[PDB]
Structures are given as C-alpha cells and as structure tokens.
C-alpha cells in the first residue's frame, strides 16, 4: 500500500490546545486525528478507514 505521509512532512503542525472559540470548533493543526480517522496516501489523498459499526 501507499506509504501514509507523516504529520512531520507537512510541518507547521502547532500543538494547539484550545478546543473551540466563538462557538465554532478549532481544528487541530496536527493531522494525527485525521490520519487516525482515515489515512492519507503517498500523494495527499484520503483513503478513509471504513467505519464498520
């Protein structure tokens, strides 16, 4: 399978801690959560881990 790109590859993934501000949520600057939800590919695609539940 295509090697999932590391979150260090993008860089500038500041470890923000604020969950939300002004009602709207605050997305994490780190792609660890998105990678966990569904892995990237070697060229920035989004093969999503099939949620069988």
């Amino acid at each position: 399978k295509y090697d999932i790109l590391a979150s260090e590859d993008v860089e500038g993934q500041e470890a923000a801690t604020l969950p939300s501000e002004g009602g709207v949520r605050i997305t994490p600057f780190n792609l660890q959560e998105e990678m966990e939800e569904g892995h990237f590919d070697a060229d920035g695609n989004y093969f999503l881990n099939r949620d069988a539940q």
Binding site: Y2, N45, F47
Partner: protein
Amino acid sequence: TAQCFLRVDDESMQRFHNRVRQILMASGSTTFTKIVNKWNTALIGLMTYFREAVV
C-alpha cells in the same frame, strides 16, 4: 423518394456504458485529470463516430 431514420445500436450504447464503468471502477488512486481524460476520449470516440445517430 425516401428517408432513413438513424439510431445507435443497443450494442454500441452498452459498450460505451461499460467503458465509462471501467473508467469509474478502475480509478482508485488516479488523479482527476486522468479520469477526465479517459472520459473525454470515450465521448469523442462515440460522438464523432455516431454523429447524428446520437442526436
């Protein structure tokens, strides 16, 4: 003295439809440009071979 109404063979329509199905099904990780290139190739082949029969 006559007319000749034209159509496209059911076989040809099914063949083109199966080609587009091959396009979508075999995609996976290909770029979007390749997918649209294959679509345009199929459309041009069909619509320049069957010019009025498509209409």
